[PDB]
Structures are given as C-alpha cells and as structure tokens.
Amino acid sequence: DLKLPRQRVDLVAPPFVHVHEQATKQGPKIMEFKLVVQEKKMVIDEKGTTFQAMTFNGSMPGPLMVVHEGDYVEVTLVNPATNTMPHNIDFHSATGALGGGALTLINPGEQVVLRWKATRTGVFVYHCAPGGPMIPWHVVSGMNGAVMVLPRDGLNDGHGHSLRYDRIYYIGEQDLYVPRDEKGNFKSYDSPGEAYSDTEEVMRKLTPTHVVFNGKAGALTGKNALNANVGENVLIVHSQANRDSRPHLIGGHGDYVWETGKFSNAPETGLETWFIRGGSAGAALYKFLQPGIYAYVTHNLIEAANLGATAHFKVEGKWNDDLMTQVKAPADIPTGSTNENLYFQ
Amino acid sequence: DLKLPRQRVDLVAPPFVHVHEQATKQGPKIMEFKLVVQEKKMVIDEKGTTFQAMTFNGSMPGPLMVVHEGDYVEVTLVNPATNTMPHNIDFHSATGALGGGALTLINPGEQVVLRWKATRTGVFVYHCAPGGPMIPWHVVSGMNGAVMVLPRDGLNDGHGHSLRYDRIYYIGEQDLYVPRDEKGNFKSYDSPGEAYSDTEEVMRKLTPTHVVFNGKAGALTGKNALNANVGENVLIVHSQANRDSRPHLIGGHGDYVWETGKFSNAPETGLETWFIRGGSAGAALYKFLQPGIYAYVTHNLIEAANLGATAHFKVEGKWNDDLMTQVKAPADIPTGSTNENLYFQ
Amino acid sequence: DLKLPRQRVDLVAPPFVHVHEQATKQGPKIMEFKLVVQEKKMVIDEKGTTFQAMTFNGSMPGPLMVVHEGDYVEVTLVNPATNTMPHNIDFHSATGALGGGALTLINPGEQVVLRWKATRTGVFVYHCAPGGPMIPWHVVSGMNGAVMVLPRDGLNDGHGHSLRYDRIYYIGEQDLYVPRDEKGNFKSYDSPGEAYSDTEEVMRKLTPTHVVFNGKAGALTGKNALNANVGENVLIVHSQANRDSRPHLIGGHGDYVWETGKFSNAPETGLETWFIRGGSAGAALYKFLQPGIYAYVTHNLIEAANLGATAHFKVEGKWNDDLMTQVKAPADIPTGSTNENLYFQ
Ligand SMILES: OC[C@H]1O[C@@](CO)(O[C@H]2O[C@H](CO)[C@@H](O)[C@H](O)[C@H]2O)[C@@H](O)[C@@H]1O
Ligand SMILES: OC[C@H]1O[C@@](CO)(O[C@H]2O[C@H](CO)[C@@H](O)[C@H](O)[C@H]2O)[C@@H](O)[C@@H]1O
Ligand SMILES: OC[C@H]1O[C@@](CO)(O[C@H]2O[C@H](CO)[C@@H](O)[C@H](O)[C@H]2O)[C@@H](O)[C@@H]1O
Ligand SMILES: OC[C@H]1O[C@@](CO)(O[C@H]2O[C@H](CO)[C@@H](O)[C@H](O)[C@H]2O)[C@@H](O)[C@@H]1O
Ligand SMILES: OC[C@H]1O[C@@](CO)(O[C@H]2O[C@H](CO)[C@@H](O)[C@H](O)[C@H]2O)[C@@H](O)[C@@H]1O
Ligand SMILES: OC[C@H]1O[C@@](CO)(O[C@H]2O[C@H](CO)[C@@H](O)[C@H](O)[C@H]2O)[C@@H](O)[C@@H]1O
Ligand SMILES: O=N[O-]
Ligand SMILES: O=N[O-]
Ligand SMILES: O=N[O-]
Ligand SMILES: [Cu+2]
Ligand SMILES: [Cu+2]
Ligand SMILES: [Cu+2]
Ligand SMILES: [Cu+2]
Ligand SMILES: [Cu+2]
Ligand SMILES: [Cu+2]
C-alpha cells in the first residue's frame, strides 16, 4: 500500500548512535528497526548490586533510533520465549493507539510489527507500557529508550543558521528502585516477578535508590568516558522516561539546548543547566573549547555523586589560557594578609 | 465608581468550563463570580479512602473562571457557618494584597467581595492562603483552582496566527498527604482539625500518598472519560497549586503548549511532555488525529498508575493507517529467526 | 600577559549586591574578587537548630559577583588554617577545568588565584566541588553562590527594548539535610566531619529538612524584609545549586523572567511562578504596582511555610483601587442567601 523504499537500520548500543545523515536529500523511506526484549539480571552499581532488569536490545537505555521527518518507522518488536512477561512499546514520537502500545502487546514467543509516521521532529522517549501498574514497573525496570526525528535539512538554531554535530551521544538516565532488607542491604531476586511486590513498595515512595546513566553507576566514567576533541560540536541527547533530571556539563555549557526536545522550537543559548521533564528527551549541542575531563551530571549533586548519575568526557586538545588560567598555584596565605578585618568575621 | 456593565457568570464543576467567548468584541465588564467554601469528607481513591477535604464550590479542583484581559473580576467568597475554619483566596492573576488573600479572610458565617483587574493574560492558579502553616494545609486539602484570562482577540500561536479550541477541559492535579497507621492503612478523622497534626507530619516529608485529577483516582476514567472527536482542537488547562507535574497525552502531543501558562508568550510546538511548576497553571492545545482511548497522565508513571494521576479521553472518528498501522499482528517468532547472533546477546 | 585595567570589587553580604553599572561604556577589565572559606556552626531555623555550615565569605548563599561580558574574573580563593577541609570553586559561568574546580583545590592555610573569561551572559551558580561525595556535601553545607555576567549594554527584553532595575536582590535558596535522633529532634555536632556520616544518610533520601533563603528560616522576614517602592523595577536573582525551586511573588508577577537565567535568551513575560533548575540561577524583573507586604516563596507551599522558604518584601507607596479593591468587607452571609440551591450541594 505505502510503496516507499525500505532501509534497514542496524541499531548500536548506547551511548553510541547508529550511522545516519543530518541533512538529507533522500525522500521519505520506510526505516526498518528491530527491538528485541531482554529480561535479565544486571549489575547497576560499583558495589555489584544486581537487579532484575527488563530491556530493549539488552541495554539501559534502549538504543537511539534516528530517522527524518516524513519517514515511516517500521518496528519489529520481539519478545523471546525466554522472557516471563508480556511487553509492548509506546513511541512518544507516534500518533495513535497510546503511541503504539495498544497495537504491540506481545507474549513471550511472539513478535509484532508496528509502523508509525515520523510527523514530529525532535528527540522523544519510547518505553514499554503493558497496562496499569505494569507501566511504571516495566519503565523503571529499564524498558525505555529514545528516537530522534531530524528535520530533512538537519538542525538549525531557529534563527535561519544550520547547526551540524561532529559527534552524538545518547545519555539515558534511569531511576531505579531497589528493595532493601531490615539491615539496609539491597535485596536480590531470582526473577522480575519475585522482585515486583517489594519493588512496587519502593516505587510508591518516589525516591530512587540509584540514578544511573547507561544502566549503571560508573558506566560512562574512566575507561568508558565519552571522547571528544577541542573544536568538535557534540550533540548530547538526554532522556528520562519517568523522572525529572537537570543535566549539566561541568566546565562547559549548552550552546544550543532544546530542553523540551522538539526541533520546531528554537533552542535556548548558553545554558548552565537544563531540565529534562520525566517522560521526555532533550538535547544539547556544545562546542568544546578546552581539553581535559568534564563531568556530565544531573545537578542534583547527591544523585550525581552518591546515586550513580555522573558520566565523563575526556577531551583532547590544547589548553586555552585566555578562557581560564591558574594565575597563582596554591600557596600559604600571606602572613601579612588581614582576612580578620573582612566584613563577615 | 467603576461604572462598567456587570455580567454574572455561573460556574460549572471541573473538568467542564462555563460558557464563554474566545475572541470577543465586547468591552471590559465587571465579571461576577461566587465561590462558596465547602469543608467535607471526600473519597479520593478506588479503594474508598476518605480524607477531610476543603474546597471551593465542593470540587477538587475549584471551578475554572474565564474572563478577558481588561475585565474586572468581582468575586464573592462565602464561608458557610457549617465550616470550621477561616478561609480566603489568593488569585495568582491579581496584583496586590497577596493576590487578594490579605483582603478576603472570612470566618464561618461570613462572606467578602473582592475585585481584581485582569491585567495579565494566561491561566493562573487561585488558592486559599490563611497564613503560616495554614497556607499549605488548605491548599493540599483541596482549596485551589484556576482562572483563565484570555486575550480579547482569543489565543494566537505567537506568530500572528489565531488559534481556536473546539473544546476545553480543566484538569486540576492535587497532591494529597493522607496519614497511615502503624499497619500502613490510611487513617480516617471526624474533622479537618483532627486530621491536621498527622497530615502535617506527612506533608513535611514532601511525598504525596495520592496524586489525583478532578479530586480522586479514576475521576476522569471509564464512564467519566473526556470526550472528543477526530479533527477537534482541544485546550487542556492543567494546574498544580503546590507541586510540579509533567503532563503527557499518550498517543498524542501538545501542538501548542504554554507550559508556564501565559499567553503573552508564544507557545512551544509539538511537545511530548510538558511541565507545570507547582504554583501554576499551563495549557496545551491538541488537534486529535486518531480515534480511540488516550491516557492523559503526569509522566511520573508511578504517580500516574499507582497514586491516581491518569485521565482518559475517548475520541470518536476514523482510524488513519498512514499515521500508524499494525503491519503484522502478534505472531510466533520465525523458528528461522537468528536473534542469538544479535550484537547485545 | 593580559594587560587590561584591574578593578578590585568589594563583595557585600546577600541579599544585597555590591555596586556595579548595568550599561557600561568601560572596556573589558580584570575584575578582582576575594572569597574566603568559613566553616562554622550556624543557626538555620526559628527554633534555634544549628548545623555545621561551610560557606564562602561567612554567608549562605555566598555573595553575588557582578561583571560584564568580556571581563576577566580573577578570584583569590582563601582557605584559612582554622578550617578542617579542603575546598575549591566551580564557576558555572567559566569554561574549562570543571569550572575552575580542577585548578582551585586548596588545603587549610592555602589560597589560590583563578582567572576566567566572562564569555557567557546570565546569572550562574558557583559552588565548591572537592571531588566525589564531597561535592554534594560541601554544596548542601552552604558552599554555593552566584555570579551575574551582564551584557555591556545592560539587560534587554529580547525585542530591542532596554530593561533597567532600580534595585537588585540576590535570593540564594539552600536545601539542608539535618540529622534527627530516634525522638525526631535535630542532632548537633562539634565539627562538620563529625556530622558527615549522619548527614550523608539524610542526603541519600533526597528530602531536605529545611529549605531556606539567605541561610535560615525567617532570614528575610520581619525586620529583614526586602524594601521596595511602588514604581521600582526590581531584579530578583534566585539560585539553587542542588535542587529545583519554583519562585513566586505573592500579589505580584514576573514581568520579565529568565528562568534558565541566560541573557542571550529573551525573557518570558507575565509569569505567575517560575522554575529554577537545581544547579542554576535565574532572574525575574518586577515593577511594583501596589504597596504592602509581599511574600516571596518557593511555591511548594509546604517548603515555603513549613521548611523555611519564605522571604518578604515591604513596599512603600499608594494603594491602587483600580488594580484591586475590597468591594465589601467581611459581613455575615445574607439570611436571604440561597446557597443550598447551588449545583454542587
Ligand atoms: O507539526 C508537525 C506535523 O504535525 C501535524 C499532525 O501530524 O500538525 C499538527 O500541528 C500543526 C502545526 O502546529 C497544526 O497546524 C495542525 O493542526 C496539527 O494537526 C502535521 O500537519 C504537521 O506537518
Ligand atoms: O543505607 C542504609 C544502610 O544500609 C547499608 C547496609 O546495612 O548499606 C546499604 O546502603 C548503602 C547506601 O545505599 C549502599 O552503599 C550499600 O550498597 C547497601 O548495602 C548500610 O551500610 C547503610 O548505613
Ligand atoms: O503586561 C500586562 C499588563 O501588566 C502591566 C501592569 O499591570 O505591565 C507590566 O508589564 C509591562 C509589559 O511587560 C511593563 O512594560 C510594565 O512596566 C509592567 O508594569 C500593564 O501595564 C500591562 O498592560
Ligand atoms: O503501603 C504500606 C502497606 O499498607 C497497607 C495496609 O497495611 O496498604 C495501605 O497502603 C496501600 C498503598 O498505599 C494502599 O493500597 C491501601 O489502601 C492502604 O491501606 C499494606 O497493604 C501495604 O503493604
Ligand atoms: O555565546 C557566548 C560566547 O561563547 C562562545 C564561546 O566562548 O561561543 C559559543 O556559542 C556561540 C554562539 O552560540 C557559537 O557560535 C560558538 O561555536 C560557541 O563556541 C563565544 O564565541 C561567544 O562570544
Ligand atoms: O518531626 C518528627 C518529630 O520530631 C520532633 C521532636 O521529637 O520535632 C522535631 O521535628 C520538628 C519538625 O522537623 C521540628 O519542629 C523540631 O525542631 C524537631 O526537633 C517532634 O516534635 C516531631 O513530631
Ligand atoms: O558544576 N558542577 O556541579
Ligand atoms: O506514553 N505514556 O506513558
Ligand atoms: O500565592 N502564593 O502562594
Ligand atoms: Cu515491558
Ligand atoms: Cu509515555
Ligand atoms: Cu481555606
Ligand atoms: Cu500562590
Ligand atoms: Cu568546600
Ligand atoms: Cu555545578
């Protein structure tokens, strides 16, 4: 019925993004994606805490899908017979049938094929939503990702100037609700169903035990730091399917930020910290101007430092002393200093 | 002193809205409204939990008032002698005297008449605010609503195009703080004053026990779903007098969203999820393009599914297979499938 | 190497702001500031609760620094030998080295001199960030302030009209996490290090015990209310280094609000309530139109009334009955009233 060309897309694991064009002269295509549900125990923190995760394609977040405005997205959702639970998918990018949820409920051993027209530009959450209390539980178990629908002319600054990224990273932020025993130790379970009742009790109090990027504390630090170079314009897509976040690049800015995540709106310029409303994706462009380590956090610093929500960028390049310089290295305070005359003493 | 024409307005119970014009050629009027305080026990959840509510006109939220820029709003606030508590009203739309609170404190058996000039366009919270700790307690007991001040030319897209709604609904979202006994069961009381001390202890921990639309879990689901038709442009006014919310229409979008709720600002286009800051109203326009059930949620899905914060729209019309279609109904996974070669296994 | 003129700035205690120009015809300068770290026990609430604070210049918040775009900011950070902890500083305004943190770690008895170029306009957080879990702990112990980088032409409305304030106030909002004993009483400690382990446990649950302006409940009420006059345009800078806030001026508005706090973006007009994302500063201009007391709150009214987050403005001037008037003072309800016929009874 459609007859458009069909293009198969091979998804890649976050924080990386499958190859795509920003600007394109190709016409609308049917862009074919496969997502395979995987329930599995995963390690979420640096102490080895495990929890019964439920994922799209084995990762938290699910992979970033990228298409262009006016493409059709044909998703094969697969629920392997090794799974225990029904699953489905809601695309916040899509129109109708609860974002596709009402057309994609599949039992273990089943798959389903949904097509949705990419009529709305931006970054959007996709997440599982089987019904009722199963909706939050599948989402905070890991079952959420994002899709980016680019304008065919690529990004602009909303003032008639093209914007182009050298690199793109997808940061999925996950709130997790891990039960504790009477001693305060995280509990383990043999299956998601066995973890449910105790997890729902934690969920109800609305306070995550962990807030993680790329599915675990430390996922995107040290060896797995995100690479960049001075002069590169980097797009940082950030999603949170359930809970607000306030992203901040420590020692940088958001040059161009779509915090509500929709490219029909002009981005804000020069932000320190932006805001991802729970149930959405946003995006920030930044041109690195200085080398070194940058931390990328939610700027609830308790969440960032103590519940897992810090990533690192390692940026190669030459230091710019005009932007910042240490004028005097740490030195003993002048014995002659008169700090005891200061107005606040 | 004023001499302008006086127009009496009959308020209607949320989520409906009293009849009004969007664009008008009438000049400024004195728009006369009556709000009557009602303290009463109300059922808030589907298990029959009751709590000692305090309301404007017997509803949570209070009714939506609609006037036009440059109208004067003359509110008679009535505090029946059957009430136990002083009450007042703060209009976030109004200028001076703590929004009118400092001019409207009335004991049981009293009424008061306040006039405020509608100088600021948008949707705004109104709420009770008697002083001190009584301010949050009266508000999270139910004593909040909204007023919409339309431009005389009606809504625009901020780019010189008129916007007109076919239908308007008012979604008041209420955080509730219901005490529990040592067993975890919700406690009942014979009066608001008797509930206060235990409720303040819950309030202090900043975690609601319920987050409800139109005063109770399930208020706007099943039989009470909101009606619409394909092709109708629907305005959805959302308020939260105390606590942030992140509205989302599942399977739809916000075509035009004023999340900060003020019509002097151009709306954002094509949002997935928006943000109502506690202490404000916002509004979203959406043109329905697909029939069926839509859920309207705060996209903290735990709040939505587990603490009461889901409404439904039932939309009549023809399905558009071009926007979305089920290409293949659920089927067993191809025995020939090679999902064990997938990159994440 | 730089040779620009050097201008020393004497900081003043919040909520006041050191003298500065809005529009300037001076060229870029090296603006010299000194911040001295002070660890000290401070009183945070009206019951006399103390906690082991850590401050810049003895205040919560740290003082507001004001410079202009293209100035260089040369900060001497001093860590007196009477302190117990290493400290540093991260300027969200600055580019490189984690905002300066990675260049400013100083032990007790040391100082350091950092220069950063003011390339980004707006209000920005600065805060301590020594590393790891010490980052949130130093920030929620008090170690955060703000810097404003004005355009050289001063503020504009983003529509080619100059905006000028008559007065400026800096409201730093602080989330505090004070341990409680088994009885619910706040605990005291002899040193920050002794308070740490019990404070980290409170921090982890993400629910402050206090949310204060200018370092304590009641800091900016009664005798310390903020002064203004009818007709004055007041800039209200609001920062929160760790946690979201929703500012509201009760009986007023935000005429011009930069809630994300960056002057390259046009402000929103006529807001009721705005949103400061944790890790940022924002700013609102308001022209007072009515005299009397205004409360300035976070519009989580529980936080405002019950956890300390209310300031007052006392505004001198003549009452404008056209904007608002009490038409009828409180009176007994007309015996003849027919309120029992009302639709909601
Ligand atoms: O806006 C992107 C895309 O959405 C559609 C619906 O699929 O239009 C919606 O938004 C338009 C612009 O705001 C409105 O004019 C329209 O009424 C609404 O349906 C597409 O038409 C549009 O290309
Ligand atoms: O958090 C309370 C209490 O629980 C203990 C175990 O008894 O540690 C648990 O909690 C810590 C913070 O979440 C985790 O680091 C640890 O993994 C977990 O087992 C106590 O150490 C702690 O005081
Ligand atoms: O903005 C709506 C309405 O508010 C008033 C005050 O009642 O003006 C305020 O905002 C104006 C536009 O931002 C400012 O120019 C003005 O200084 C401020 O008092 C009305 O004048 C206006 O019609
Ligand atoms: O929530 C804790 C604990 O309390 C119990 C009663 O002992 O149930 C209460 O809490 C539930 C969630 O809020 C409610 O559904 C119910 O209405 C309430 O009485 C336990 O069932 C629960 O485990
Ligand atoms: O934007 C203020 C200031 O920031 C700099 C970097 O110091 O520019 C950044 O943002 C510009 C405008 O968005 C971009 O064009 C640029 O690529 C980015 O580095 C300065 O150049 C500018 O004056
Ligand atoms: O808050 C719980 C419980 O603790 C007590 C002391 O036993 O009071 C403490 O908590 C109050 C609220 O935070 C504070 O006003 C007071 O300063 C603090 O000591 C009880 O009174 C209260 O019920
Ligand atoms: O600047 N980072 O917390
Ligand atoms: O798309 N709704 O959770
Ligand atoms: O209007 N203040 O809560
Ligand atoms: Cu699922
Ligand atoms: Cu959703
Ligand atoms: Cu009241
Ligand atoms: Cu209010
Ligand atoms: Cu410090
Ligand atoms: Cu920071």
- How far, in Å, CA of A171 to CA of A73, rounded? 22
- How far, in Å, CA of A242 to CA of C263, rounded? 31
CA distances from A255 to A21, A235, A281, A312 (A): 22, 10, 17, 18
Strand partners, C77: C35, C112
Number of helices followed by number of strands (H, E) in chain C: 3, 22
Residue from B40, B332, B173 nearest A110 by CA: B332
Q: Is residue A283 within a helix (H) or strand (E), and if so which, with residue range?
A: strand A280-287
Query: What token pair was written down for C71?
Result: 């100035």
CA distances from B341 to A143, B290, C250 (A): 21, 38, 62
Give chain B positions within 8 Å (CB) of A135: 301, 304-305
- How far, in Å, CA of A96 to CA of B143, rounded? 36
Q: Is residue A111 within a helix (H) or strand (E), and if so which, with residue range?
A: strand A110-117
Query: What token pair was written down for B137?
Result: 């307690």
For A185-190, which contacts have Cβ atoms below 8 Å and span 24 or more sequence positions? A186/A49, A186/A51, A188/A50, A189/A52
Q: Give, using CA atoms, the residue closest to atom 3 of ligand 3.
A: B119
Which amino acid appears at position A137 of this protein?
A: W
Instruction: Please work out whether the CB of residue A277 comes within 6 Å of at least one atom of ligand 5.
Output: no
Q: Is residue C332 within a helix (H) or strand (E), and if so which, with residue range?
A: strand C324-332
First to last CA, chain C: 79
**Within a 10 A sphere around the Cβ of A165, how many other Cβ atoms?**
18
First to last CA, chain A: 79
- How far, in Å, CA of B164 to CA of C79, rounded? 61
Partners of chain A (3+ Cβ pairs below 8 A): B, C
**Within a 10 A sphere around the Cβ of C69, how many other Cβ atoms?**
18
Of all residues in chain B, the one with the smallest CA distance to C335 is B109
C-alpha angle B6/B8/B11, rounded to 5°?
150
Which residue of A58, A139, A262 is in closest CB contact with B270? Answer: A262
Report CA A217 to chain centroid distance, whole Å.
Answer: 14
Burial of C36: CB neighbours in 10 Å, binned 0-12, 13-18, 19+: buried
User: What distance in angstroms lies between residue B184's CA and the mean position of ligand 4's atoms?
Assistant: 5
Mutate to test the interface with A, among C112, C240, C277 (most CBs of A within 10 A): C277
Residue A312 annotated in active site: no
Query: What token pair was written down for B85?
Result: 């508590």
Which amino acid appears at position A73 of this protein?
A: V
Which amino acid appears at position C277 of this protein?
A: R
Residue B92 annotated as lining a ligand binding site? yes
| Beta strand pairing call for C226-229 and B233-240 | unpaired
* Size (chain B), residues: 345
Residue from B328, B262, B317, B326 nearest B290 by CA: B317
Torsions phi, psi for B215 (to 5 deg)? 85, -5
* Size (chain A), residues: 345
- How far, in Å, CA of B174 to CA of B152, rounded? 30
Q: Give, using CA atoms, the residue closest to atom 19 of ligand 2.
A: A185
Is B243 within 8 Å of B139 (Cβ atoms)? no
Instruction: Please work out whether the CB of residue A306 comes within 6 Å of at least one atom of ligand 2.
Output: no
Is B39 within 8 Å of B87 (Cβ atoms)? no
Q: Kindly calculate the radius of gyration of chain C based on its CA atoms and give it in whole angstroms.
A: 22
C270 CA: distance to closest CA in chain B (Å) = 6
- How far, in Å, CA of A100 to CA of A97, rounded? 5
Strand partners, B42: B51
Q: What is the resolution of this structure in A?
A: 1.3
Greatest CA separation found in chain B?
85
Token match 């009818």: residue? C230
User: What distance in angstroms lies between residue A186's CA and the mean position of ligand 2's atoms?
Assistant: 7
Cα pseudo-dihedral B170, B175, B179, B184, rounded to 10? 100
Three-state DSSP class for residue C192: helix
- How far, in Å, CA of C97 to CA of C107, rounded? 18
Residue from C46, C43, C54, C55 nearest C11 by CA: C55
Residue from B277, B280, B276, B258 nearest B267 by CA: B258
Three-state DSSP class for residue B310: strand
Experimental method: X-ray
- Give the 3-state secondary structure percentages of chain A, helix then strand then coil, rounded to 5: 10, 40, 45
CA distances from C249 to C230, C242, C269, C313 (A): 15, 22, 14, 9
- How far, in Å, CA of A178 to CA of A171, rounded? 21
Number of helices followed by number of strands (H, E) in chain B: 3, 22
Give, as one character, the DSSP assignment of residue B133.
T
Is C235 within 8 Å of C165 (Cβ atoms)? yes
Token match 């400061």: residue? C276
Report CA A206 to chain centroid distance, whole Å.
Answer: 20
Residue from A341, A326, A194, B107 nearest C111 by CA: A326
Q: Does residue B61 have a cis bond before it (omega within 30 degrees)? A: yes
Select from A164, A287, A321 the residue to mutate for testing ligand 5; criterion: most ligand atoms less than 8 Å from CB.
Answer: A287
Query: What token pair was written down for B18?
Result: 């009293």
Query: What token pair was written down for A147?
Result: 């899709």
Which amino acid appears at position C32 of this protein?
A: E
Which residue of A253, A268, A292 is in closest CB contact with C97? Answer: A292
Count CA atoms within 13 Å of residue C229 on its CB side: 5
| Beta strand pairing call for B310-316 and B292-298 | antiparallel
CB-proximal residues (5 Å) to ion ligand 14: C 87, 128, 138, 143
Mutate to test the interface with B, among A95, A121, A275 (most CBs of B within 10 A): A95
Three-state DSSP class for residue A341: helix
- Give the 3-state secondary structure percentages of chain B, helix then strand then coil, rounded to 5: 10, 40, 45
- How far, in Å, CA of B11 to CA of C266, rounded? 37
- How far, in Å, CA of B150 to CA of B235, rounded? 13
Give me the helices (H) in chain A, please.
134-140, 192-204, 301-306
Burial of A215: CB neighbours in 10 Å, binned 0-12, 13-18, 19+: buried
The residues spanned by each domain of chain B are 1-151, 152-318
Token match 């870029």: residue? C28
Kindly determine whether residue B328 and residue A206, on different chains, have CB atoms separated by under 8 Å.
no
C-alpha angle B134/B137/B142, rounded to 5°?
125
Which amino acid appears at position B240 of this protein?
A: Q
Token match 């002193």: residue? B1
- How far, in Å, CA of A271 to CA of A282, rounded? 13
Give chain A positions within 8 Å (CB) of C117: 322-324
- How far, in Å, CA of C35 to CA of C40, rounded? 15
* B:C CB pairs within 8 Å: 187
Catalytic residues of B: 87, 90, 92, 127-128, 138, 143, 248, 272-273, 299
Three-state DSSP class for residue A103: helix
Kindly determine whether residue B133 and residue C306, on different chains, have CB atoms separated by under 8 Å.
yes
Which residue of C320, C330, C343 is in closest CB contact with B110? Answer: C330
Is B65 within 8 Å of B173 (Cβ atoms)? no
**Within a 10 A sphere around the Cβ of B3, how many other Cβ atoms?**
6
| Beta strand pairing call for C6-8 and C30-43 | parallel
Which residue of A327, A339, A344 is in closest CB contact with C59? Answer: A344
Partners of chain C (3+ Cβ pairs below 8 A): A, B
- How far, in Å, CA of C210 to CA of C89, rounded? 24
Give chain C positions within 8 Å (CB) of A259: 260
Q: Does residue B334 have a cis bond before it (omega within 30 degrees)? A: no
Kindly determine whether residue B333 and residue A121, on different chains, have CB atoms separated by under 8 Å.
no
Number of helices followed by number of strands (H, E) in chain A: 3, 22
B66 CA: distance to closest CA in chain C (Å) = 17
- How far, in Å, CA of C38 to CA of C138, rounded? 12
| Buried-exposed string B297-318: b where 16+ CB fall within 10 A, e elsewhere | bbbbbbbbbbbbbbbbbebeee
Is B146 within 8 Å of B281 (Cβ atoms)? yes
CA distances from C211 to B185, B204, C175 (A): 30, 11, 5
**Within a 10 A sphere around the Cβ of A109, how many other Cβ atoms?**
15
Kindly determine whether residue B136 and residue C301, on different chains, have CB atoms separated by under 8 Å.
yes
- How far, in Å, CA of C140 to CA of C136, rounded? 6
Q: Does residue A14 have a cis bond before it (omega within 30 degrees)? A: no
- How far, in Å, CA of B133 to CA of B200, rounded? 9
User: What distance in angstroms lies between residue B264's CA and the mean position of ligand 3's atoms?
Assistant: 11
Q: Is residue B199 within a helix (H) or strand (E), and if so which, with residue range?
A: helix B192-204
* Size (chain C), residues: 345
Give, as one character, the DSSP assignment of residue C175.
E
Of all residues in chain C, the one with the smallest CA distance to B133 is C305
Give me the helices (H) in B46-154, please.
134-140
Token match 């400013």: residue? C104
